[PDB]
Amino acid sequence: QLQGNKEYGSEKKGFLLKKSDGIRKVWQRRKCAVKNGILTISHATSNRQPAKLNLLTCQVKPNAEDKKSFDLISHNRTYHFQAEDEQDYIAWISVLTNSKEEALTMAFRG
């Protein structure tokens, strides 16, 4: 019995705001894409290869203090994101969860 939301797909490309780790923790706009249970998040600034997160090993956790915010929690690290509007918020949490669930279904089929 699978979580997500069928109103959305399992792939998305767009922008998200990400809170920086270090420099007074400022919010910064990054290019992000989900496909095949993988989330790719650009850094500032390529230069670097984008970060790649395996959603099967991450928790998606809506943020209790801002309506458009959510976190991705890996084994290692917490990423704080903010969508650019409420519609985009529901789309990202839905696509992330769908992508995870699809992939989990494939993994636990094999």
PDB file of N, CA and C in Angstrom:
ATOM      1  N   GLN A   1       0.843  -1.242   0.000  1.00  0.00           N
ATOM      2  CA  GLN A   1       0.000   0.000   0.000  1.00  0.00           C
ATOM      3  C   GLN A   1       0.858   1.264   0.000  1.00  0.00           C
ATOM      4  N   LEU A   2       0.812   2.013  -1.105  1.00  0.00           N
ATOM      5  CA  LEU A   2       1.810   3.053  -1.387  1.00  0.00           C
ATOM      6  C   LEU A   2       1.328   4.477  -1.063  1.00  0.00           C
ATOM      7  N   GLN A   3       2.254   5.283  -0.535  1.00  0.00           N
ATOM      8  CA  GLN A   3       2.084   6.718  -0.279  1.00  0.00           C
ATOM      9  C   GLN A   3       2.491   7.514  -1.552  1.00  0.00           C
ATOM     10  N   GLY A   4       2.036   8.773  -1.561  1.00  0.00           N
ATOM     11  CA  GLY A   4       2.307   9.758  -2.585  1.00  0.00           C
ATOM     12  C   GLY A   4       1.011  10.427  -2.932  1.00  0.00           C
ATOM     13  N   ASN A   5       0.885  10.784  -4.228  1.00  0.00           N
ATOM     14  CA  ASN A   5      -0.292  11.442  -4.730  1.00  0.00           C
ATOM     15  C   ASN A   5      -0.384  11.342  -6.244  1.00  0.00           C
ATOM     16  N   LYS A   6      -1.388  10.680  -6.694  1.00  0.00           N
ATOM     17  CA  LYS A   6      -1.473  10.396  -8.139  1.00  0.00           C
ATOM     18  C   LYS A   6      -1.765  11.608  -9.039  1.00  0.00           C
ATOM     19  N   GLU A   7      -2.092  12.741  -8.448  1.00  0.00           N
ATOM     20  CA  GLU A   7      -2.335  13.986  -9.177  1.00  0.00           C
ATOM     21  C   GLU A   7      -1.004  14.392  -9.836  1.00  0.00           C
ATOM     22  N   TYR A   8       0.127  13.882  -9.356  1.00  0.00           N
ATOM     23  CA  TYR A   8       1.482  14.247  -9.852  1.00  0.00           C
ATOM     24  C   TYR A   8       2.220  13.041 -10.308  1.00  0.00           C
ATOM     25  N   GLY A   9       3.292  13.288 -11.061  1.00  0.00           N
ATOM     26  CA  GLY A   9       4.107  12.239 -11.604  1.00  0.00           C
ATOM     27  C   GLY A   9       5.226  11.868 -10.634  1.00  0.00           C
ATOM     28  N   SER A  10       6.223  11.181 -11.172  1.00  0.00           N
ATOM     29  CA  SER A  10       7.434  10.790 -10.420  1.00  0.00           C
ATOM     30  C   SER A  10       8.709  11.460 -10.971  1.00  0.00           C
ATOM     31  N   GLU A  11       8.596  12.429 -11.880  1.00  0.00           N
ATOM     32  CA  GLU A  11       9.691  13.217 -12.348  1.00  0.00           C
ATOM     33  C   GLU A  11       9.320  14.659 -12.353  1.00  0.00           C
ATOM     34  N   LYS A  12      10.290  15.521 -12.058  1.00  0.00           N
ATOM     35  CA  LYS A  12      10.079  16.971 -12.035  1.00  0.00           C
ATOM     36  C   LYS A  12      11.424  17.664 -12.170  1.00  0.00           C
ATOM     37  N   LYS A  13      11.441  18.774 -12.891  1.00  0.00           N
ATOM     38  CA  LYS A  13      12.607  19.656 -12.923  1.00  0.00           C
ATOM     39  C   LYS A  13      12.146  21.030 -12.502  1.00  0.00           C
ATOM     40  N   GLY A  14      12.884  21.705 -11.678  1.00  0.00           N
ATOM     41  CA  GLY A  14      12.508  23.061 -11.330  1.00  0.00           C
ATOM     42  C   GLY A  14      13.492  23.689 -10.391  1.00  0.00           C
ATOM     43  N   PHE A  15      13.049  24.686  -9.639  1.00  0.00           N
ATOM     44  CA  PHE A  15      13.893  25.421  -8.724  1.00  0.00           C
ATOM     45  C   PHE A  15      13.403  25.168  -7.370  1.00  0.00           C
ATOM     46  N   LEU A  16      14.331  25.124  -6.436  1.00  0.00           N
ATOM     47  CA  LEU A  16      13.952  25.133  -5.062  1.00  0.00           C
ATOM     48  C   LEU A  16      14.894  26.085  -4.389  1.00  0.00           C
ATOM     49  N   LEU A  17      14.436  26.698  -3.300  1.00  0.00           N
ATOM     50  CA  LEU A  17      15.344  27.407  -2.408  1.00  0.00           C
ATOM     51  C   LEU A  17      15.933  26.413  -1.422  1.00  0.00           C
ATOM     52  N   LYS A  18      17.249  26.521  -1.181  1.00  0.00           N
ATOM     53  CA  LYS A  18      17.912  25.687  -0.209  1.00  0.00           C
ATOM     54  C   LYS A  18      18.647  26.585   0.762  1.00  0.00           C
ATOM     55  N   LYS A  19      18.544  26.250   2.043  1.00  0.00           N
ATOM     56  CA  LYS A  19      19.227  27.020   3.075  1.00  0.00           C
ATOM     57  C   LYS A  19      20.686  26.604   3.052  1.00  0.00           C
ATOM     58  N   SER A  20      21.589  27.574   3.016  1.00  0.00           N
ATOM     59  CA  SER A  20      23.025  27.220   2.964  1.00  0.00           C
ATOM     60  C   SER A  20      23.452  26.689   4.324  1.00  0.00           C
ATOM     61  N   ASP A  21      24.516  25.901   4.327  1.00  0.00           N
ATOM     62  CA  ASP A  21      25.013  25.310   5.583  1.00  0.00           C
ATOM     63  C   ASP A  21      25.664  26.388   6.505  1.00  0.00           C
ATOM     64  N   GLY A  22      26.474  27.253   5.886  1.00  0.00           N
ATOM     65  CA  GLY A  22      27.593  27.916   6.552  1.00  0.00           C
ATOM     66  C   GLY A  22      27.597  29.429   6.796  1.00  0.00           C
ATOM     67  N   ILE A  23      27.323  30.169   5.720  1.00  0.00           N
ATOM     68  CA  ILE A  23      27.461  31.659   5.648  1.00  0.00           C
ATOM     69  C   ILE A  23      26.255  32.436   6.216  1.00  0.00           C
ATOM     70  N   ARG A  24      26.015  32.330   7.528  1.00  0.00           N
ATOM     71  CA  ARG A  24      24.798  32.881   8.148  1.00  0.00           C
ATOM     72  C   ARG A  24      23.602  32.185   7.530  1.00  0.00           C
ATOM     73  N   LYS A  25      23.809  30.966   7.038  1.00  0.00           N
ATOM     74  CA  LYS A  25      22.720  30.121   6.604  1.00  0.00           C
ATOM     75  C   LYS A  25      21.677  30.823   5.726  1.00  0.00           C
ATOM     76  N   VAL A  26      22.111  31.366   4.592  1.00  0.00           N
ATOM     77  CA  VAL A  26      21.196  32.142   3.742  1.00  0.00           C
ATOM     78  C   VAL A  26      20.453  31.194   2.786  1.00  0.00           C
ATOM     79  N   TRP A  27      19.230  31.574   2.442  1.00  0.00           N
ATOM     80  CA  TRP A  27      18.478  30.893   1.410  1.00  0.00           C
ATOM     81  C   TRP A  27      18.983  31.217   0.005  1.00  0.00           C
ATOM     82  N   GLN A  28      19.114  30.200  -0.857  1.00  0.00           N
ATOM     83  CA  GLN A  28      19.637  30.372  -2.209  1.00  0.00           C
ATOM     84  C   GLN A  28      18.869  29.531  -3.193  1.00  0.00           C
ATOM     85  N   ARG A  29      18.626  30.047  -4.373  1.00  0.00           N
ATOM     86  CA  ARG A  29      17.844  29.358  -5.363  1.00  0.00           C
ATOM     87  C   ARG A  29      18.712  28.351  -6.107  1.00  0.00           C
ATOM     88  N   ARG A  30      18.311  27.079  -6.162  1.00  0.00           N
ATOM     89  CA  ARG A  30      19.031  26.027  -6.880  1.00  0.00           C
ATOM     90  C   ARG A  30      18.169  25.286  -7.916  1.00  0.00           C
ATOM     91  N   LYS A  31      18.785  24.790  -8.975  1.00  0.00           N
ATOM     92  CA  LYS A  31      18.120  23.979  -9.965  1.00  0.00           C
ATOM     93  C   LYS A  31      18.119  22.557  -9.431  1.00  0.00           C
ATOM     94  N   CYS A  32      16.951  21.909  -9.471  1.00  0.00           N
ATOM     95  CA  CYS A  32      16.742  20.590  -8.887  1.00  0.00           C
ATOM     96  C   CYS A  32      15.955  19.714  -9.871  1.00  0.00           C
ATOM     97  N   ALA A  33      16.190  18.418  -9.839  1.00  0.00           N
ATOM     98  CA  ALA A  33      15.473  17.482 -10.742  1.00  0.00           C
ATOM     99  C   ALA A  33      15.318  16.180 -10.018  1.00  0.00           C
ATOM    100  N   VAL A  34      14.161  15.519 -10.174  1.00  0.00           N
ATOM    101  CA  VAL A  34      13.900  14.188  -9.643  1.00  0.00           C
ATOM    102  C   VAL A  34      13.603  13.277 -10.777  1.00  0.00           C
ATOM    103  N   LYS A  35      14.257  12.124 -10.796  1.00  0.00           N
ATOM    104  CA  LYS A  35      14.011  11.124 -11.847  1.00  0.00           C
ATOM    105  C   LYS A  35      14.604   9.835 -11.335  1.00  0.00           C
ATOM    106  N   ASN A  36      13.928   8.702 -11.583  1.00  0.00           N
ATOM    107  CA  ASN A  36      14.430   7.392 -11.167  1.00  0.00           C
ATOM    108  C   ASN A  36      14.775   7.291  -9.661  1.00  0.00           C
ATOM    109  N   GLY A  37      14.002   7.912  -8.800  1.00  0.00           N
ATOM    110  CA  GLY A  37      14.238   7.891  -7.327  1.00  0.00           C
ATOM    111  C   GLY A  37      15.512   8.604  -6.887  1.00  0.00           C
ATOM    112  N   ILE A  38      15.986   9.500  -7.715  1.00  0.00           N
ATOM    113  CA  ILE A  38      17.178  10.324  -7.463  1.00  0.00           C
ATOM    114  C   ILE A  38      16.835  11.825  -7.540  1.00  0.00           C
ATOM    115  N   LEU A  39      17.233  12.547  -6.521  1.00  0.00           N
ATOM    116  CA  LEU A  39      17.180  13.961  -6.543  1.00  0.00           C
ATOM    117  C   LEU A  39      18.546  14.590  -6.759  1.00  0.00           C
ATOM    118  N   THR A  40      18.659  15.432  -7.774  1.00  0.00           N
ATOM    119  CA  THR A  40      19.899  16.139  -8.115  1.00  0.00           C
ATOM    120  C   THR A  40      19.670  17.601  -7.755  1.00  0.00           C
ATOM    121  N   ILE A  41      20.584  18.168  -7.013  1.00  0.00           N
ATOM    122  CA  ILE A  41      20.478  19.573  -6.570  1.00  0.00           C
ATOM    123  C   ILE A  41      21.730  20.308  -6.938  1.00  0.00           C
ATOM    124  N   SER A  42      21.607  21.391  -7.690  1.00  0.00           N
ATOM    125  CA  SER A  42      22.809  22.143  -8.065  1.00  0.00           C
ATOM    126  C   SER A  42      23.463  22.779  -6.794  1.00  0.00           C
ATOM    127  N   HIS A  43      24.760  22.988  -6.864  1.00  0.00           N
ATOM    128  CA  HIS A  43      25.473  23.753  -5.830  1.00  0.00           C
ATOM    129  C   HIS A  43      25.461  25.248  -6.199  1.00  0.00           C
ATOM    130  N   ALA A  44      26.118  26.087  -5.393  1.00  0.00           N
ATOM    131  CA  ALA A  44      26.710  27.333  -5.892  1.00  0.00           C
ATOM    132  C   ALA A  44      28.227  27.139  -5.953  1.00  0.00           C
ATOM    133  N   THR A  45      28.857  27.250  -7.133  1.00  0.00           N
ATOM    134  CA  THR A  45      28.190  27.218  -8.460  1.00  0.00           C
ATOM    135  C   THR A  45      29.064  26.390  -9.351  1.00  0.00           C
ATOM    136  N   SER A  46      28.449  25.643 -10.265  1.00  0.00           N
ATOM    137  CA  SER A  46      29.249  24.780 -11.145  1.00  0.00           C
ATOM    138  C   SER A  46      30.305  25.614 -11.879  1.00  0.00           C
ATOM    139  N   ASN A  47      31.615  25.310 -11.811  1.00  0.00           N
ATOM    140  CA  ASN A  47      32.333  24.352 -10.918  1.00  0.00           C
ATOM    141  C   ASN A  47      31.703  22.977 -10.653  1.00  0.00           C
ATOM    142  N   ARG A  48      31.033  22.811  -9.496  1.00  0.00           N
ATOM    143  CA  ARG A  48      30.853  21.490  -8.909  1.00  0.00           C
ATOM    144  C   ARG A  48      29.732  20.731  -9.579  1.00  0.00           C
ATOM    145  N   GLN A  49      29.934  19.429  -9.657  1.00  0.00           N
ATOM    146  CA  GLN A  49      28.885  18.502 -10.025  1.00  0.00           C
ATOM    147  C   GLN A  49      27.730  18.580  -8.999  1.00  0.00           C
ATOM    148  N   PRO A  50      26.460  18.557  -9.468  1.00  0.00           N
ATOM    149  CA  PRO A  50      25.341  18.597  -8.531  1.00  0.00           C
ATOM    150  C   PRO A  50      25.340  17.460  -7.511  1.00  0.00           C
ATOM    151  N   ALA A  51      24.824  17.746  -6.318  1.00  0.00           N
ATOM    152  CA  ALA A  51      24.595  16.730  -5.302  1.00  0.00           C
ATOM    153  C   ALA A  51      23.549  15.770  -5.806  1.00  0.00           C
ATOM    154  N   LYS A  52      23.687  14.507  -5.469  1.00  0.00           N
ATOM    155  CA  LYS A  52      22.777  13.470  -5.895  1.00  0.00           C
ATOM    156  C   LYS A  52      22.390  12.679  -4.662  1.00  0.00           C
ATOM    157  N   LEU A  53      21.084  12.588  -4.416  1.00  0.00           N
ATOM    158  CA  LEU A  53      20.515  11.909  -3.262  1.00  0.00           C
ATOM    159  C   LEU A  53      19.660  10.784  -3.741  1.00  0.00           C
ATOM    160  N   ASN A  54      19.866   9.622  -3.160  1.00  0.00           N
ATOM    161  CA  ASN A  54      19.032   8.479  -3.453  1.00  0.00           C
ATOM    162  C   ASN A  54      17.794   8.531  -2.545  1.00  0.00           C
ATOM    163  N   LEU A  55      16.645   8.798  -3.133  1.00  0.00           N
ATOM    164  CA  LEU A  55      15.434   9.028  -2.320  1.00  0.00           C
ATOM    165  C   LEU A  55      15.025   7.793  -1.521  1.00  0.00           C
ATOM    166  N   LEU A  56      15.454   6.600  -1.967  1.00  0.00           N
ATOM    167  CA  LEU A  56      15.153   5.392  -1.257  1.00  0.00           C
ATOM    168  C   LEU A  56      15.825   5.335   0.089  1.00  0.00           C
ATOM    169  N   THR A  57      16.880   6.110   0.273  1.00  0.00           N
ATOM    170  CA  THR A  57      17.553   6.201   1.533  1.00  0.00           C
ATOM    171  C   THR A  57      17.338   7.536   2.307  1.00  0.00           C
ATOM    172  N   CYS A  58      16.342   8.318   1.911  1.00  0.00           N
ATOM    173  CA  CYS A  58      16.018   9.625   2.461  1.00  0.00           C
ATOM    174  C   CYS A  58      14.594   9.652   2.981  1.00  0.00           C
ATOM    175  N   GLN A  59      14.383  10.523   3.960  1.00  0.00           N
ATOM    176  CA  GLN A  59      13.052  10.831   4.469  1.00  0.00           C
ATOM    177  C   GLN A  59      12.677  12.235   3.999  1.00  0.00           C
ATOM    178  N   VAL A  60      11.453  12.391   3.524  1.00  0.00           N
ATOM    179  CA  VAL A  60      10.902  13.676   3.148  1.00  0.00           C
ATOM    180  C   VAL A  60      10.060  14.126   4.363  1.00  0.00           C
ATOM    181  N   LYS A  61      10.336  15.291   4.922  1.00  0.00           N
ATOM    182  CA  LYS A  61       9.698  15.716   6.137  1.00  0.00           C
ATOM    183  C   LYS A  61       9.244  17.160   5.985  1.00  0.00           C
ATOM    184  N   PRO A  62       7.909  17.387   5.852  1.00  0.00           N
ATOM    185  CA  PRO A  62       7.413  18.781   5.815  1.00  0.00           C
ATOM    186  C   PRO A  62       7.876  19.529   7.055  1.00  0.00           C
ATOM    187  N   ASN A  63       8.138  20.818   6.905  1.00  0.00           N
ATOM    188  CA  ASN A  63       8.635  21.665   7.957  1.00  0.00           C
ATOM    189  C   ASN A  63       7.465  22.281   8.726  1.00  0.00           C
ATOM    190  N   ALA A  64       7.470  22.158  10.041  1.00  0.00           N
ATOM    191  CA  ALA A  64       6.299  22.573  10.861  1.00  0.00           C
ATOM    192  C   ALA A  64       6.098  24.092  11.042  1.00  0.00           C
ATOM    193  N   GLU A  65       7.080  24.889  10.647  1.00  0.00           N
ATOM    194  CA  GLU A  65       7.092  26.338  10.871  1.00  0.00           C
ATOM    195  C   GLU A  65       6.934  27.188   9.621  1.00  0.00           C
ATOM    196  N   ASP A  66       7.068  26.639   8.402  1.00  0.00           N
ATOM    197  CA  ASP A  66       6.810  27.440   7.212  1.00  0.00           C
ATOM    198  C   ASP A  66       6.031  26.617   6.216  1.00  0.00           C
ATOM    199  N   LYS A  67       4.963  27.223   5.723  1.00  0.00           N
ATOM    200  CA  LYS A  67       3.996  26.500   4.911  1.00  0.00           C
ATOM    201  C   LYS A  67       4.596  25.908   3.646  1.00  0.00           C
ATOM    202  N   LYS A  68       5.647  26.527   3.130  1.00  0.00           N
ATOM    203  CA  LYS A  68       6.247  26.080   1.852  1.00  0.00           C
ATOM    204  C   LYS A  68       7.554  25.281   2.020  1.00  0.00           C
ATOM    205  N   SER A  69       7.931  24.966   3.251  1.00  0.00           N
ATOM    206  CA  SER A  69       9.175  24.370   3.552  1.00  0.00           C
ATOM    207  C   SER A  69       9.090  22.904   3.821  1.00  0.00           C
ATOM    208  N   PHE A  70      10.151  22.181   3.430  1.00  0.00           N
ATOM    209  CA  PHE A  70      10.310  20.764   3.770  1.00  0.00           C
ATOM    210  C   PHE A  70      11.790  20.447   3.861  1.00  0.00           C
ATOM    211  N   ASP A  71      12.082  19.356   4.538  1.00  0.00           N
ATOM    212  CA  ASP A  71      13.430  18.874   4.696  1.00  0.00           C
ATOM    213  C   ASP A  71      13.580  17.523   4.022  1.00  0.00           C
ATOM    214  N   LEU A  72      14.775  17.243   3.545  1.00  0.00           N
ATOM    215  CA  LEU A  72      15.162  15.880   3.133  1.00  0.00           C
ATOM    216  C   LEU A  72      16.241  15.438   4.051  1.00  0.00           C
ATOM    217  N   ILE A  73      16.012  14.301   4.691  1.00  0.00           N
ATOM    218  CA  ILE A  73      16.893  13.813   5.702  1.00  0.00           C
ATOM    219  C   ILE A  73      17.521  12.554   5.121  1.00  0.00           C
ATOM    220  N   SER A  74      18.833  12.608   4.835  1.00  0.00           N
ATOM    221  CA  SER A  74      19.633  11.405   4.440  1.00  0.00           C
ATOM    222  C   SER A  74      20.247  10.804   5.689  1.00  0.00           C
ATOM    223  N   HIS A  75      20.978   9.686   5.550  1.00  0.00           N
ATOM    224  CA  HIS A  75      21.618   9.029   6.698  1.00  0.00           C
ATOM    225  C   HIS A  75      22.523  10.014   7.433  1.00  0.00           C
ATOM    226  N   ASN A  76      23.047  10.934   6.658  1.00  0.00           N
ATOM    227  CA  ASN A  76      24.174  11.729   6.926  1.00  0.00           C
ATOM    228  C   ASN A  76      23.878  13.183   7.226  1.00  0.00           C
ATOM    229  N   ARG A  77      22.807  13.714   6.637  1.00  0.00           N
ATOM    230  CA  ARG A  77      22.684  15.137   6.406  1.00  0.00           C
ATOM    231  C   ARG A  77      21.211  15.507   6.314  1.00  0.00           C
ATOM    232  N   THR A  78      20.867  16.721   6.749  1.00  0.00           N
ATOM    233  CA  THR A  78      19.540  17.306   6.561  1.00  0.00           C
ATOM    234  C   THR A  78      19.619  18.479   5.578  1.00  0.00           C
ATOM    235  N   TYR A  79      18.778  18.451   4.551  1.00  0.00           N
ATOM    236  CA  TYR A  79      18.729  19.500   3.556  1.00  0.00           C
ATOM    237  C   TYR A  79      17.443  20.246   3.852  1.00  0.00           C
ATOM    238  N   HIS A  80      17.498  21.564   3.971  1.00  0.00           N
ATOM    239  CA  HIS A  80      16.295  22.385   4.197  1.00  0.00           C
ATOM    240  C   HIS A  80      15.948  23.062   2.923  1.00  0.00           C
ATOM    241  N   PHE A  81      14.745  22.791   2.431  1.00  0.00           N
ATOM    242  CA  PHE A  81      14.245  23.393   1.204  1.00  0.00           C
ATOM    243  C   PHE A  81      12.991  24.258   1.432  1.00  0.00           C
ATOM    244  N   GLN A  82      12.769  25.209   0.520  1.00  0.00           N
ATOM    245  CA  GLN A  82      11.555  25.951   0.440  1.00  0.00           C
ATOM    246  C   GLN A  82      11.126  26.059  -0.992  1.00  0.00           C
ATOM    247  N   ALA A  83       9.888  25.674  -1.271  1.00  0.00           N
ATOM    248  CA  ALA A  83       9.314  25.835  -2.590  1.00  0.00           C
ATOM    249  C   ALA A  83       8.987  27.295  -2.798  1.00  0.00           C
ATOM    250  N   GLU A  84       8.877  27.690  -4.049  1.00  0.00           N
ATOM    251  CA  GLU A  84       8.582  29.086  -4.370  1.00  0.00           C
ATOM    252  C   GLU A  84       7.127  29.491  -4.224  1.00  0.00           C
ATOM    253  N   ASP A  85       6.203  28.542  -4.205  1.00  0.00           N
ATOM    254  CA  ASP A  85       4.834  28.875  -3.851  1.00  0.00           C
ATOM    255  C   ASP A  85       4.118  27.646  -3.381  1.00  0.00           C
ATOM    256  N   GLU A  86       2.891  27.811  -2.928  1.00  0.00           N
ATOM    257  CA  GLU A  86       2.224  26.706  -2.254  1.00  0.00           C
ATOM    258  C   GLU A  86       1.880  25.598  -3.233  1.00  0.00           C
ATOM    259  N   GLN A  87       1.525  25.961  -4.457  1.00  0.00           N
ATOM    260  CA  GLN A  87       1.273  24.961  -5.499  1.00  0.00           C
ATOM    261  C   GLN A  87       2.540  24.113  -5.805  1.00  0.00           C
ATOM    262  N   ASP A  88       3.665  24.797  -5.883  1.00  0.00           N
ATOM    263  CA  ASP A  88       4.950  24.156  -6.141  1.00  0.00           C
ATOM    264  C   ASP A  88       5.346  23.261  -4.936  1.00  0.00           C
ATOM    265  N   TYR A  89       4.981  23.687  -3.733  1.00  0.00           N
ATOM    266  CA  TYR A  89       5.212  22.897  -2.536  1.00  0.00           C
ATOM    267  C   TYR A  89       4.535  21.552  -2.628  1.00  0.00           C
ATOM    268  N   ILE A  90       3.279  21.584  -2.961  1.00  0.00           N
ATOM    269  CA  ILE A  90       2.557  20.276  -3.040  1.00  0.00           C
ATOM    270  C   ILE A  90       3.098  19.381  -4.171  1.00  0.00           C
ATOM    271  N   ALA A  91       3.435  20.000  -5.281  1.00  0.00           N
ATOM    272  CA  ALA A  91       4.052  19.285  -6.395  1.00  0.00           C
ATOM    273  C   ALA A  91       5.357  18.620  -5.987  1.00  0.00           C
ATOM    274  N   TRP A  92       6.282  19.389  -5.358  1.00  0.00           N
ATOM    275  CA  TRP A  92       7.571  18.775  -4.965  1.00  0.00           C
ATOM    276  C   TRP A  92       7.369  17.658  -3.958  1.00  0.00           C
ATOM    277  N   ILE A  93       6.587  17.849  -2.890  1.00  0.00           N
ATOM    278  CA  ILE A  93       6.481  16.747  -1.908  1.00  0.00           C
ATOM    279  C   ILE A  93       5.812  15.507  -2.481  1.00  0.00           C
ATOM    280  N   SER A  94       4.850  15.749  -3.353  1.00  0.00           N
ATOM    281  CA  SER A  94       4.198  14.689  -4.046  1.00  0.00           C
ATOM    282  C   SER A  94       5.119  13.943  -5.021  1.00  0.00           C
ATOM    283  N   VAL A  95       5.853  14.652  -5.885  1.00  0.00           N
ATOM    284  CA  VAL A  95       6.766  14.007  -6.836  1.00  0.00           C
ATOM    285  C   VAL A  95       7.893  13.272  -6.120  1.00  0.00           C
ATOM    286  N   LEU A  96       8.433  13.878  -5.070  1.00  0.00           N
ATOM    287  CA  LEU A  96       9.479  13.205  -4.304  1.00  0.00           C
ATOM    288  C   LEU A  96       8.994  11.905  -3.706  1.00  0.00           C
ATOM    289  N   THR A  97       7.835  11.929  -3.076  1.00  0.00           N
ATOM    290  CA  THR A  97       7.274  10.726  -2.507  1.00  0.00           C
ATOM    291  C   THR A  97       6.918   9.707  -3.569  1.00  0.00           C
ATOM    292  N   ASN A  98       6.296  10.150  -4.656  1.00  0.00           N
ATOM    293  CA  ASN A  98       6.000   9.220  -5.768  1.00  0.00           C
ATOM    294  C   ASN A  98       7.239   8.550  -6.362  1.00  0.00           C
ATOM    295  N   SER A  99       8.251   9.345  -6.596  1.00  0.00           N
ATOM    296  CA  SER A  99       9.498   8.804  -7.127  1.00  0.00           C
ATOM    297  C   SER A  99      10.108   7.741  -6.183  1.00  0.00           C
ATOM    298  N   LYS A 100      10.101   8.033  -4.878  1.00  0.00           N
ATOM    299  CA  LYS A 100      10.548   7.091  -3.846  1.00  0.00           C
ATOM    300  C   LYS A 100       9.735   5.806  -3.874  1.00  0.00           C
ATOM    301  N   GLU A 101       8.415   5.938  -3.871  1.00  0.00           N
ATOM    302  CA  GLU A 101       7.538   4.778  -3.857  1.00  0.00           C
ATOM    303  C   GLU A 101       7.619   3.935  -5.106  1.00  0.00           C
ATOM    304  N   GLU A 102       7.695   4.571  -6.251  1.00  0.00           N
ATOM    305  CA  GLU A 102       7.912   3.793  -7.477  1.00  0.00           C
ATOM    306  C   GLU A 102       9.186   2.945  -7.421  1.00  0.00           C
ATOM    307  N   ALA A 103      10.264   3.616  -7.061  1.00  0.00           N
ATOM    308  CA  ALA A 103      11.558   2.974  -6.977  1.00  0.00           C
ATOM    309  C   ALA A 103      11.510   1.845  -5.920  1.00  0.00           C
ATOM    310  N   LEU A 104      10.938   2.098  -4.744  1.00  0.00           N
ATOM    311  CA  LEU A 104      10.814   1.053  -3.730  1.00  0.00           C
ATOM    312  C   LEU A 104      10.102  -0.155  -4.197  1.00  0.00           C
ATOM    313  N   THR A 105       9.058   0.071  -4.972  1.00  0.00           N
ATOM    314  CA  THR A 105       8.324  -1.031  -5.584  1.00  0.00           C
ATOM    315  C   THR A 105       9.197  -1.880  -6.505  1.00  0.00           C
ATOM    316  N   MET A 106       9.985  -1.226  -7.359  1.00  0.00           N
ATOM    317  CA  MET A 106      10.959  -1.948  -8.171  1.00  0.00           C
ATOM    318  C   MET A 106      12.016  -2.690  -7.332  1.00  0.00           C
ATOM    319  N   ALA A 107      12.592  -2.037  -6.336  1.00  0.00           N
ATOM    320  CA  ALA A 107      13.616  -2.645  -5.512  1.00  0.00           C
ATOM    321  C   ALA A 107      13.094  -3.871  -4.741  1.00  0.00           C
ATOM    322  N   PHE A 108      11.925  -3.744  -4.123  1.00  0.00           N
ATOM    323  CA  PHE A 108      11.383  -4.836  -3.357  1.00  0.00           C
ATOM    324  C   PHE A 108      10.643  -5.861  -4.235  1.00  0.00           C
ATOM    325  N   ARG A 109      10.416  -5.583  -5.521  1.00  0.00           N
ATOM    326  CA  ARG A 109      10.052  -6.632  -6.485  1.00  0.00           C
ATOM    327  C   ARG A 109      11.277  -7.542  -6.755  1.00  0.00           C
ATOM    328  N   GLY A 110      12.491  -6.977  -6.751  1.00  0.00           N
ATOM    329  CA  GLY A 110      13.725  -7.762  -6.931  1.00  0.00           C
ATOM    330  C   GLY A 110      14.532  -7.932  -5.648  1.00  0.00           C
TER     331      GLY A 110
END
